[PDB]
Design a protein around this nucleic acid. Structure first.
Ligand code: CL
Ligand code: NA
Ligand code: NA
Ligand code: NA
Lengths: 216, 460
DNA sequence: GGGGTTTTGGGG
DNA sequence: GGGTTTTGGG
DNA sequence: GGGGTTTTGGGG
């Protein structure tokens, strides 16, 4: 049984084509998690891995209401509780976003969270980027594999096998290796993007706007 | 410069002392804050290497060297145990019972590494030859000087090391934990196992398949840049690892930025024994082939022994640079790893065609054996780590008409329309080859712009 | 000039 | 020092 | 004091 809440959640989301509805509802309960960092990157840990929660304009506001004196960009070392959250899939550039993998990011959209001030959480292993976990990385690769395999089986047709006479008795025959490259789908650029999961999207605040909005 | 032996160095002088020593263990240079990097290592010499052998069971005795610096590039990267280090201006003191040499590299101290073996790890990787048996393969500061009177200390200690590493374990049983007990550890521990497999997870990550003397098999992610010396069949010592309680599909070891994977010098008694003792394991693979989705990678093939010592080339170089790269044009044979996304022709029964060696044409056998010589005309649509994100699939063929790769399937070509036993075996292989996490380690020959598999046999 | 360091103001 | 950075090899 | 560098005798 998976002990890491984040790993189990993010895994079930990916295994269910990024459909937050198909994922078990028994895991949609409040999430109490420690805050490793808060700036320049806000990261929380479920006791095992750290993930970057994306705050909506509503959340950061509601937070300020019941907690005016509380600065979010300073919650480091302090634990927080999320009562209204939703996980959604998003295609990103892993070369810039370190909280993703293979240009795919599973985001934790937080609608509302409370700061459990001074509460002292239990000491656990050193938290790590869930997106650097061997098993979770493989999970995502599986996700892409399925999408890639289906895409190719839909685009490639007619058993257009390389003519054998081209490789048989080819002493005086010379060829360019790029003659073996095959386009997987109709995708625009050189990047494969023929996924079936409906890429969700919700206006989320940049951890920077929450900085100036509290200490310009 | 005067060189003192580890056991003869003063404890009360607190004066800068210099010495030569053999590195048997060391953390990786790591950062502790916004200005300091550290590297701690275990050193030995002819006067400090073994403990009171009566009730010690042949345990290793050593000194500890802690090098402090303000820049990563000022600390020694220890890839292999057995090499020699020369330190200048170190302050010795007793730290919890053991001789602890401290050196503030960010001030006046300095170090230098000398390869005990002919070549240093790096030079071995690049196939480079050492400048001389008196040249450091790495040193702090801009300059390093090897006085004539030192050549003896270096040569002698170099000899002592081999005799030492060959006569003792160096890395005694009290220095590492058994993998089958790794789950019982409270925190981090050390490992000494054989690298059964090096799987390229992605552009910057290797996944080592470890197996030690206890028989347990664990996996761990090893960056390519940080540990470019990992080699299959080799034995290594992992400094600081943690059992991953969150991995259910497979036993995993977690490493930290200060963790280090170290190999051993040729004369290593421990390395030699474990290399021959710890044999390959396929239990994980065999078992994973029974599950719908296996989070465990499975290398379905094995290349002929004659190629075992051949560097692999990625599909990226194979299909996008093989015609423009100077070094990739001189060779026609290559080794590569990839996963099959699709197999053509779709109908498995058409895998074996009839081949008329004359018209060079082939045809279906759905109508007797006259069509000609039976051959495998299979076309694989592959992909790999280096091409993971692109919208391409690469063609790799198994055309055995000329004999190349005629046994890849461990099934001699035959009319699959009539031979049920043959067709069935191939249909099974088809399911494995296209299953996620299944891979192929195969050697290929470049023929008229195409890559045909050869000297590669399925092992499942 | 500025570190580290202890020389705590002055060599080369 | 048997340890935890951002460079998010370190 | 002593590097390394240039400040070339003096800060902290
Ligand atoms: Cl060619
Ligand atoms: Na000074
Ligand atoms: Na000076
Ligand atoms: Na000066």
């Amino acid at each position: 049984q998976q002990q890491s809440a984040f790993k189990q959640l993010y895994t079930e989301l990916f295994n269910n084509e990024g459909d937050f509805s198909k994922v078990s509802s028994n895991l949609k309960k409040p999430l109490k998690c420690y805050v490793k960092e808060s700036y320049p990157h806000f990261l929380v840990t479920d006791g095992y891995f750290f993930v970057a929660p994306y705050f909506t304009k509503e959340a950061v506001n509601e937070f300020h209401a019941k907690f005016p004196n509380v600065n979010i960009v300073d919650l480091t070392d302090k634990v927080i509780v999320i009562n209204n959250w939703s996980l959604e899939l998003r295609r990103v550039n892993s070369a810039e976003v370190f909280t993703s993998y293979a240009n795919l990011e599973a985001r934790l959209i937080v609608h509302s969270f409370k700061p459990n001030l001074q509460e002292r959480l239990n000491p656990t292993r050193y938290p790590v980027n869930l997106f650097r976990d061997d098993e979770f990385k493989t999970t995502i690769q599986h996700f892409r594999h399925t999408a890639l395999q289906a895409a190719i089986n839909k685009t490639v047709k007619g058993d257009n096998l390389v003519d054998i006479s081209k490789v048989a008795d080819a002493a005086g025959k010379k060829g360019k290796v790029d003659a073996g490259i095959v386009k997987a789908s109709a995708s625009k650029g050189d990047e494969f993007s023929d996924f079936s999961f409906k890429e969700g999207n919700t206006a989320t605040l940049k951890i920077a706007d929450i900085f100036v909005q509290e200490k310009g | 410069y005067e060189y003192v032996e580890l056991a003869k160095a003063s404890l009360t002088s607190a004066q800068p002392q210099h010495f030569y020593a053999v590195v048997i263990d060391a953390t990786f240079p790591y950062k502790t804050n916004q200005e300091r990097y550290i590297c701690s290592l275990k050193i030995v010499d002819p006067t400090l290497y073994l403990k009171q052998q009566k009730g010690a069971g042949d345990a290793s005795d050593y000194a500890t060297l802690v090098l402090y610096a303000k820049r990563f590039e000022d600390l020694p990267i220890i890839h292999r145990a057995g090499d020699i280090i020369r330190v200048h201006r170190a302050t010795l003191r007793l730290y919890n019972g053991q001789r602890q040499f401290n050196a503030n590299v960010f001030y006046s101290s300095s170090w230098a590494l000398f390869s005990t073996d002919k070549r240093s790890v790096t030079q071995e990787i690049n196939n480079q030859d050492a400048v001389s048996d008196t040249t450091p393969f790495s040193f702090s500061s801009k300059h390093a000087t090897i006085e004539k009177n030192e050549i003896s200390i270096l040569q002698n200690l170099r000899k002592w090391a081999n005799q030492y590493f060959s006569s003792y374990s160096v890395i005694s049983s009290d220095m590492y934990t058994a993998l089958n007990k790794a789950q019982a550890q409270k925190g981090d521990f050390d490992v000494v196992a054989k690298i059964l497999q090096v799987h390229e997870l992605d552009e910057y990550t290797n996944e080592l398949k470890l197996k030690d003397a206890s028989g347990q098999v664990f996996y761990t992610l090893s960056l390519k840049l940080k540990f470019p010396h990992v080699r299959t069949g080799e034995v290594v010592r992992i400094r600081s690892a943690t059992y991953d309680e969150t991995s259910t599909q497979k036993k995993v070891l977690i490493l930290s930025h200060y963790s280090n994977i170290i190999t051993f010098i040729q004369s290593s008694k421990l390395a030699k024994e474990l290399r021959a003792k710890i044999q390959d394991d396929h239990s994980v693979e065999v078992a994973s082939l029974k599950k719908n989705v296996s989070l465990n990678a499975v290398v379905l093939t094995e290349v002929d022994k004659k190629h075992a010592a051949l560097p692999s080339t990625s599909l990226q170089d194979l299909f996008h640079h093989a015609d423009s790269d100077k070094e990739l044009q001189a060779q026609d044979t290559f080794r590569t790893q990839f996963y099959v996304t699709k197999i053509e022709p779709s109908d498995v029964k058409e895998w074996v065609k009839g081949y008329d060696r004359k018209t060079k044409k082939s045809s279906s056998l759905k109508g007797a054996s006259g069509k000609g010589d039976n051959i495998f005309q299979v076309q694989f649509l592959v992909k790999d780590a280096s091409t993971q994100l692109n919208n391409n699939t690469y063609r790799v063929l198994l055309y055995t008409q000329d004999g190349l790769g005629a046994n890849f399937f461990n099934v001699k070509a035959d009319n699959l329309h009539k031979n049920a036993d043959a067709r069935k075996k191939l249909e099974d292989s088809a399911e494995l080859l296209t299953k996620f996490n299944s891979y192929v380690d195969a050697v290929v020959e470049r023929r008229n712009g195409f890559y045909l598999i050869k000297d590669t046999k399925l092992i499942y």
